Design a protein around this ligand. Structure first.
Ligand SMILES: CCCCCCCCCCCCCCCCCC(=O)OC[C@H](COP(=O)([O-])OCC(O)COP(=O)([O-])OC[C@@H](COC(=O)CCCCCCCCCCCCCCCCC)OC(=O)CCCCCCCCCCCCCCCCC)OC(=O)CCCCCCCCCCCCCCCCC
Ligand SMILES: CCCCCCCCCCCCCCCCCC(=O)OC[C@H](COP(=O)([O-])OCC(O)COP(=O)([O-])OC[C@@H](COC(=O)CCCCCCCCCCCCCCCCC)OC(=O)CCCCCCCCCCCCCCCCC)OC(=O)CCCCCCCCCCCCCCCCC
Ligand SMILES: CCCCCCCCCCCCCCCCCC(=O)OC[C@H](COP(=O)([O-])OCC(O)COP(=O)([O-])OC[C@@H](COC(=O)CCCCCCCCCCCCCCCCC)OC(=O)CCCCCCCCCCCCCCCCC)OC(=O)CCCCCCCCCCCCCCCCC
Ligand SMILES: CCCCCCCCCCCCCCCCCC(=O)OC[C@H](COP(=O)([O-])OCC(O)COP(=O)([O-])OC[C@@H](COC(=O)CCCCCCCCCCCCCCCCC)OC(=O)CCCCCCCCCCCCCCCCC)OC(=O)CCCCCCCCCCCCCCCCC
Ligand SMILES: CCCCCCCCCCCCCCCCC[C@@H](O)O[C@H](CO[C@H](O)CCCCCCCCCCCCCCC)COP(=O)(O)OCC[N+](C)(C)C
Ligand SMILES: CCCCCCCCCCCCCCCCC[C@@H](O)O[C@H](CO[C@H](O)CCCCCCCCCCCCCCC)COP(=O)(O)OCC[N+](C)(C)C
Ligand SMILES: CCCCCCCC/C=C\CCCCCCCC(=O)OC[C@H](COP(=O)(O)OCCN)OC(=O)CCCCCCC/C=C\CCCCCCCC
Ligand SMILES: CCCCCCCC/C=C\CCCCCCCC(=O)OC[C@H](COP(=O)(O)OCCN)OC(=O)CCCCCCC/C=C\CCCCCCCC
Lengths: 347, 140, 98, 175, 115, 121, 54, 49
């Protein structure tokens, strides 16, 4: 792809997301989603192969169906109240349609199936984009209409997402599918607190994006897409594997790391309500994500796997292009828990 | 929907074990039917008759579990003259677990289902008595 | 609510189910997507015509424009799938199973 | 209940949707969607939206011509299926037909809720406006306001169209 | 009302013409007469086999160029607005981008058929 | 949710004019020192990733890291303090304007209240 | 004396298509090293036309 | 020794060092001035000094 065309497509994706965020009109939000999808499809197919075509097709079909449902919900809301402004969503049937449309755009269970397949079929850069930037617009829309959101449906989908992400991640050897399942579980954690406090949702979003950016940038630095290809990295880049292990621990949620803070705040916010059982189940289920993170850490940093002879030639060459902000993302992804009260600048 | 659960809950705890068992088996049948729908959607059976066989198997197992649970819990509540107690629900849950183990023809599944279903039913009864909310309304 | 509204909403639901159910050819699914656009256009136009909102008369035009954008996107993807496999069968799109 | 014309047109709309919803080959699915586009054009003509109905008919005619070309190129088989040549297609077709008839019967006979809320029928002529005003047409003025009021819509739409051309180029590039 | 009568009359006249054409003459159809027409011999394959489309890229662009017509047809009415300077800016903007999209596909060899 | 919509609020200000009536955080604030420590750690990780002497490779870029983190942290702390001050102001005003919902109860002494005694044995 | 470190037999249990191999997924194969599946040599079928004699 | 001379110079890249140190100094001076202005403004509003 031409660099100019690639830059234009990336800016069109970003402009669609910004249009979703800055619009007070339902039609303009729909147009932002459609522009985002239109520019997003080629980026997944930047490196051409049958798997990339499959991922692009599946992503397009899922997002197009979601756009259908979103427009239908908008039209029903217009029919029952001649309002075009993104607000309380005066009709409950339209609200259910909108909730399922946005959940299927996000990948929340039971609509989670598309995410592992699309993440595995594309490169690591497109996977980074898909799992970080493509979550902002649906979550922004969900935040704007959280007053009319139904707790029973949203909490059911969030708990389902946490359970399914934890379970599906256990079976995975490929790194992209592991990241997709962890993304699903984090999405569930984000949307569980949505009807109670959207500031906690935004905080979890920012922490998850920081950790995900760090992890994808580490996986791009060490060109590893499977468990055993990452098992070789210690023989060339031990510091990278150590940083990856600390980032994985942070992803798991163990204190005093940055990852612990979002769950800690969500649990506190839910227990400010009555809501005792559900946070308990959420933590006991996040234990599964911690387990397969630890499996990755065992394979990559805490043990030394056998290497090959040709690594001696790689020993003589440096990493050509260094991605900026990798150091910053690692630090923000690990050592930020003492700055927890600064979340008050988010509401 | 939840009208099944209202028809189950509108019956007093220690009265009319037949009606309570009917409501419980209706709930079980609905759950098994939903499970069958998802299983057929995700794992096709390669033929229509094998699919209806799987649907009937799952639905019958769930309905039997629910019926046994409701009947045993109601009978235990009324013979012991002790309603508002989670022990009746525990006994019903273990009876349902034994039913599941017999349906799957396995002693280990039967014992595990006894323990876990009894614990779950006891917790549900405790939540009914105390007022625990699975899906709390936002209040703050 | 009138009865024509029932008919339009039933048309939308039928097209959504038709899209959800997949037979073999991808082309038929794109047909169902375009039918869903058609139903949404008709519903929007009827509501917009009935209550005299003058400024929303343009949004069905924009809806059709972005419908065409989706149609072109789907056709390009179908071209590439057929080039890879020689048929537009969805059964072939199973590489990401493993 | 006055000549039932809007009712008949909407019923044919649903019938065409059932026809192409069945997925009994692209050539016949295109025919069904063309019929649906025509009857929808008529439906919105009956409400005063002549420009919108004609334009959607034109757009869908062009789209269905492109789809016919693509069906003969890449979505064809030895024996294309019609609505009676396969048990699944025929079953879906008759199921859609009977569902439409059932909801029509349970709507005309009783005012019982189907999904959103129960309706009345009574003929869609009752809900009209008695509007006696204007030497212009409201719909044409509203659509023409896309250039005076809808600058933002024009900008986003034109950008989307240019980007879509670039996108189809990149996707079908190949390599 | 009158357009319905006109359409019904035209369709009925055409249908009666077909009916006359099929029921007036003497039909004698046998298997050889109704066989598919190749010039002299029997076809090798089927007419239902895939037929490659060398202008597939122009066909997709036709969909996007067709919807640029839906945006320009209300222009005769838009010329009657009071603020003509913002209308003329928007109408020319909508055609420059249409011209630039045609130029882009032209320069990138998108208008050439597949060889 | 709770603070998203409030009267007289500029959308993207990040620091309203009424925030200047609050004491600014001291430059030796422990949170600012922690932000500077985060900048130093980022600089060290930058040195280690690029295969450079971790402690001594780039002093100018490490200084830039530290000062950038401190600079962002100062305004972050200002906004944090402003939002907490708004929370307390609103809560106090709401308590004052709704006396019947926050009534001062009668003061009882431990000689009058009867607490049940549970022996340990 | 020296600490135990994983060998080939240990490392090959993380080299399959999935963890926990089963009966259904035993015949799955891991994706290609570069995510490029071999091109399916699809037989091209041109249209054969009788041009003439009539 | 190096076969090729490692494009990152054997001397410091004085341009990058220059603007890096310059932006660090500018940021520190701006922060000091902002802090002083905030202190004076706060004392002015609250009637302290
Ligand atoms: C008050 C309510 C009461 C409780 C309700 C809540 C609890 C529900 C319990 C259901 C547990 C879920 C799983 C069941 C077992 C696994 C499935 C299976 O194969 O079973 C075969 C298994 C033995 O057969 P097998 O051949 O050895 O197993 C085959 C292989 O092992 C392997 O088999 P397989 O590979 O073919 O697996 C099947 C297949 C298919 O997977 C499934 O089966 C899906 C099942 C999930 C459905 C959940 C049911 C909950 C319904 C709630 C509402 C009820 C309405 C009333 O799996 C998959 O392909 C992937 C699964 C995961 C992917 C995502 C699926 C999740 C979908 C979303 C969940 C529900 C969404 C609801 C709405 C969402 C909108 C936000 O057990 C059975 O025989 C079936 C019976 C199951 C027991 C049901 C117990 C009912 C008790 C009711 C008592 C009521 C008393 C009175 C109350 C007061
Ligand atoms: C506004 C929002 C709302 C929007 C949504 C609104 C939707 C409603 C409007 C829809 C109108 C329909 C118009 C067109 C639809 C398009 C159909 C289509 O394209 O077909 C493609 C699709 C693909 O076929 P194909 O690839 O060309 O042929 C290859 C073979 O099909 C496959 O190859 P094979 O033979 O090797 O495979 C083995 C065999 C295997 O065959 C089987 O295994 C099926 C046997 C299942 C037994 C059913 C349970 C029996 C007992 C239940 C009793 C109920 C309660 C009674 C008391 C309890 C009793 C104990 O075939 C299958 O795998 C088929 C399984 C899928 C069945 C159909 C899926 C529908 C939903 C899932 C139902 C699952 C049933 C479980 C129970 C559900 C709860 C009752 O065709 C089919 O799947 C076959 C059936 C299609 C004909 C009927 C379609 C109508 C269904 C519409 C929705 C259902 C009703 C909704 C009403 C809601 C109230 C208003
Ligand atoms: C924290 C500190 C440490 C704690 C941890 C350690 C302790 C706890 C863990 C250890 C024990 C728990 C293990 C659970 C059971 C495991 C079964 C299993 O794994 O299945 C796979 C395993 C093999 O799998 P498979 O291929 O499906 O079966 C092929 C067989 O190998 C082929 O077998 P077969 O063909 O030769 O014959 C099979 C058949 C024929 O049976 C036999 O072959 C032999 C008979 C075995 C059981 C029948 C009872 C006869 C002896 C009992 C006499 C009185 C005992 C003392 C009680 C009064 C105290 C004064 O079995 C039956 O029909 C028996 C039905 C069950 C009736 C027993 C009812 C006992 C309820 C408890 C009442 C007392 C509670 C204590 C209250 C005390 C208050 C002061 O199944 C078995 O072989 C075991 C079946 C027999 C069940 C034994 C369980 C009774 C022990 C008490 C359990 C209560 C503890 C937990 C409470 C909650 C449980 C509901
Ligand atoms: C709570 C209180 C404070 C605690 C805060 C947290 C800890 C401190 C901050 C952490 C971040 C800071 C540094 C991070 C980047 C450094 C990376 C590194 O490798 O360092 C190498 C570097 C030595 O390398 P070199 O000299 O360039 O040449 C040797 C080659 O480079 C040799 O290169 P190589 O290729 O041969 O290296 C291979 C090696 C290299 O692998 C590593 O070195 C591991 C890298 C550390 C991961 C850091 C991730 C982010 C930090 C998270 C910390 C988590 C804390 C929470 C608790 C959970 C613990 C995980 O990998 C392995 O051999 C595999 C071993 C697998 C073990 C798995 C465990 C690793 C994770 C443990 C992290 C725990 C914190 C460690 C902090 C210090 C570590 C250097 O270490 C240093 O010299 C820096 C140490 C600190 C300098 C401070 C000195 C300033 C002046 C002193 C005076 C103080 C004030 C004076 C005023 C008083 C008035 C008079
Ligand atoms: C501020 C920083 C912006 C940075 C981001 C730039 C990205 C967007 C591009 C520029 C922003 C577009 C804003 C335009 C909003 C339209 C409304 C405003 O501009 O007024 C209009 C002014 O009209 C002008 O024509 C505005 C458009 C001029 C710009 C031409 C389009 C070029 C934009 C670049 C992006 C397009 C993509 C393709 C590149 C060529 C109408 O004024 P008026 O008619 O009195 O009042 C109408 C109301 N009535 C009916 C009551 C009278
Ligand atoms: C690991 C931590 C991740 C942090 C993520 C990146 C850190 C740097 C953030 C970049 C700073 C620039 C962003 C904005 C600066 C100027 C723009 C200004 O207008 O923003 C206003 C206010 O600024 C931002 O809103 C707040 C950004 C502050 C981010 C830091 C908080 C991190 C959470 C706590 C973790 C501790 C981090 C410690 C430092 C590393 C917006 O006000 P408003 O229009 O009304 O908000 C609308 C949306 N709401 C109401 C729903 C919130
Ligand atoms: C609370 C709900 C109570 C659920 C209790 C049931 C759990 C029983 C599990 C104990 C293990 C029993 C056992 O022997 O497993 C058999 C049994 C089926 O035979 P297999 O072992 O898989 O066959 C292997 C060889 N072909 O295992 C299972 O399928 C069940 C395992 C998971 C049960 C479902 C757990 C779901 C919990 C959350 C639901 C929401
Ligand atoms: C729109 C432009 C054209 C207008 C359309 C209609 C034109 C009307 C012209 C009428 C001319 C009369 C048509 C007569 C020819 C009909 C076909 C014909 O020739 O069949 C001959 C056939 C041979 O039969 P056999 O000898 O028994 O068996 C031999 C096979 N073993 O003989 C017949 O059956 C002829 C029967 C009389 C036909 C009736 C004609 C009456 C006029 C009808 C005009 C309709 C216009 C409306």
């Amino acid at each position: 792809m031409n660099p100019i065309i690639y830059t234009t497509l990336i800016m069109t994706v970003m402009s669609g997301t910004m249009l979703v965020m800055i619009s007070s009109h339902w039609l303009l939000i729909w147009i932002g989603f459609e522009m985002n999808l239109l520019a997003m499809i080629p980026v997944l197919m930047k490196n051409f192969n049958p798997r990339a075509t499959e991922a692009a097709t599946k992503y397009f079909l899922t997002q197009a169906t979601a756009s259908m449902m979103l427009m239908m919900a908008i039209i029903i809301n217009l029919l029952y109240s001649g309002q075009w402004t993104i607000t309380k969503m005066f009709n409950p049937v339209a609200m259910t349609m909108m909730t399922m449309a946005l959940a299927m755009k996000l990948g929340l269970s039971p609509f989670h199936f598309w995410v592992p397949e699309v993440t595995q079929g594309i490169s690591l850069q497109a996977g980074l984009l898909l799992l970080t930037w493509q979550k902002l617009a649906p979550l922004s829309v969900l935040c704007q209409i959280s007053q009319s959101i139904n707790p029973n449906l949203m909490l059911t989908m969030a708990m389902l997402s946490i359970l399914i992400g934890g379970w599906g991640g256990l079976n995975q050897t490929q790194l992209r599918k592991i990241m997709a399942y962890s993304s699903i579980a984090h999405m569930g954690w984000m949307t569980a607190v949505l009807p109670y406090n959207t500031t906690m949702t935004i905080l979890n979003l920012l922490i998850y994006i920081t950790m995900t950016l760090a992890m994808f940038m580490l996986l791009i630095h060490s060109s590893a897409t499977t468990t055993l290809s990452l098992s070789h990295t210690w023989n060339k880049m031990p510091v990278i594997t150590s940083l990856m292990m600390v980032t994985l621990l942070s992803m798991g949620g163990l204190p005093p790391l940055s990852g612990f803070m979002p769950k800690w705040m969500i649990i506190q916010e839910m227990t400010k309500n009555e809501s005792i059982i559900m946070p308990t189940l959420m933590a006991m289920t996040a234990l599964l994500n911690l387990y397969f993170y630890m499996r990755l850490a065992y394979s990559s940093s805490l043990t030394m796997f056998p290497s090959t002879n040709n690594m001696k030639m790689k020993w003589q060459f440096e990493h050509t292009k260094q991605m900026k902000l990798l150091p910053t993302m690692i630090v923000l992804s690990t050592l930020v828990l003492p700055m927890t009260p600064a979340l008050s600048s988010l509401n | 929907a939840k009208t099944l659960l209202h028809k189950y809950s509108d019956i007093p705890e220690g009265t009319e074990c037949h009606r309570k068992a009917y409501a419980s088996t209706s709930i079980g049948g609905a759950t098994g039917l939903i499970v069958s729908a998802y299983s057929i959607a995700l794992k096709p059976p390669a033929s229509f008759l094998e699919g209806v066989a799987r649907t009937g198997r799952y639905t019958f197992t769930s309905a039997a579990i629910g019926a046994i649970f409701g009947l045993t819990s109601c009978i235990s509540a009324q013979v012991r003259e002790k309603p508002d107690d989670p022990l009746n629900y525990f006994i019903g849950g273990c009876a349902g677990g034994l039913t599941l183990g017999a349906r799957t023809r396995s002693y280990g599944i039967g014992a595990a289902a006894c323990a876990y279903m009894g614990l779950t039913a006891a917790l549900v009864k405790m939540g009914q008595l105390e007022g625990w909310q699975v899906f709390a309304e936002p209040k703050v | 609510m009138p009865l024509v509204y029932m008919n339009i909403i039933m048309a939308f639901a039928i097209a959504l189910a038709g899209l959800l159910m997949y037979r073999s050819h991808l082309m038929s699914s794109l047909l169902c997507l375009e039918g869903m656009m058609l139903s949404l256009f008709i519903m929007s136009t009827l509501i917009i015509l009935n209550t005299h909102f003058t400024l929303a008369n343009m949004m069905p035009i924009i809806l059709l424009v972005f419908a065409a954008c989706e149609a072109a996107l789907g056709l390009s993807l179908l071209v590439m799938v057929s080039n890879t496999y020689g048929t537009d069968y969805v059964q072939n799109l199973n590489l990401l199973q493993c | 209940m006055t000549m039932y014309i809007a009712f008949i047109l909407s019923t044919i709309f649903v019938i065409g949707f059932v026809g192409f919803s069945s997925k009994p080959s692209p050539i016949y699915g295109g025919l069904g969607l063309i019929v649906s586009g025509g009857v929808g054009c008529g439906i919105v003509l009956n409400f005063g939206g002549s420009f919108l109905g004609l334009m959607v008919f034109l757009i869908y005619l062009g789209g269905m011509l492109v789809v016919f070309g693509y069906t003969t190129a890449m979505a064809t088989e030895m024996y294309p299926e019609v609505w009676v040549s396969n048990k699944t297609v025929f079953g879906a077709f008759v199921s859609g037909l009977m569902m439409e008839f059932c909801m029509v019967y349970y709507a005309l006979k009783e005012e019982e809720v189907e999904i959103i809320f129960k309706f009345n029928g009574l003929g869609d002529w009752v809900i009209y406006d008695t509007g006696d005003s204007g030497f212009f047409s409201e719909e044409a003025m509203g659509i023409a306001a896309l250039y005076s009021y809808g600058t933002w819509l024009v900008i986003v739409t034109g950008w989307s169209l240019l980007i879509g051309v670039v996108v189809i180029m990149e996707i079908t590039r190949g390599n | 009302m009158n357009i319905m009568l006109t359409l019904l009359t035209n369709v009925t006249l055409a249908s009666l013409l077909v009916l006359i054409a099929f029921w007036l003459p003497q039909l004698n159809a046998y298997s050889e007469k109704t066989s598919p027409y190749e010039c002299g011999f029997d076809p090798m394959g089927s007419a239902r086999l895939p037929f490659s489309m060398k202008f597939f890229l122009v066909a997709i662009t036709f969909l996007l160029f067709d919807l640029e017509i839906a945006l320009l047809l209300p222009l005769p009415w838009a010329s009657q607005t009071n603020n003509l300077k913002t209308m003329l800016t928007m109408a020319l903007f909508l055609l420059i981008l249409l011209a630039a999209s045609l130029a882009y596909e032209w320069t990138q060899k998108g208008l050439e058929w597949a060889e | 949710t709770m603070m998203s919509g409030r009267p007289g609020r500029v959308p993207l200000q990040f620091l309203p004019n009424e925030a200047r009536s609050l004491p600014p955080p001291k430059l030796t604030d422990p949170r600012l020192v922690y932000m500077g420590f985060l900048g130093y750690c980022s600089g060290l990780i930058d040195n280690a990733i690029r295969r450079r002497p971790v402690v001594s490779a780039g002093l100018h870029r490490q200084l830039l890291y530290v000062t950038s983190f401190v600079f962002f942290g100062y305004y972050l702390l200002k906004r944090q303090d402003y939002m907490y001050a708004l929370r307390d102001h609103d809560m106090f005003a709401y308590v004052k304007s709704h006396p019947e919902d926050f009534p001062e109860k009668d003061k009882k002494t431990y000689g009058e209240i009867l607490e049940e005694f549970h022996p340990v044995r | 004396a020296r600490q135990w470190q994983p060998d080939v037999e240990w490392a090959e249990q993380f080299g399959g298509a999935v963890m926990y191999p089963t009966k259904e997924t035993a015949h799955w194969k891991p994706p290609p090293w570069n995510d490029v599946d071999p091109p399916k040599d699809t037989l091209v079928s041109n249209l054969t036309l009788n041009f003439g004699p009539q | 020794k190096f076969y090729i001379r490692e494009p990152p110079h054997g001397s410091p890249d004085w341009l990058k060092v220059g603007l890096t140190l310059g932006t660090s100094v500018f940021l520190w001076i701006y922060l000091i001035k902002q802090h002083k202005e905030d202190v004076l403004e706060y004392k002015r509003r609250n009637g302290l000094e």
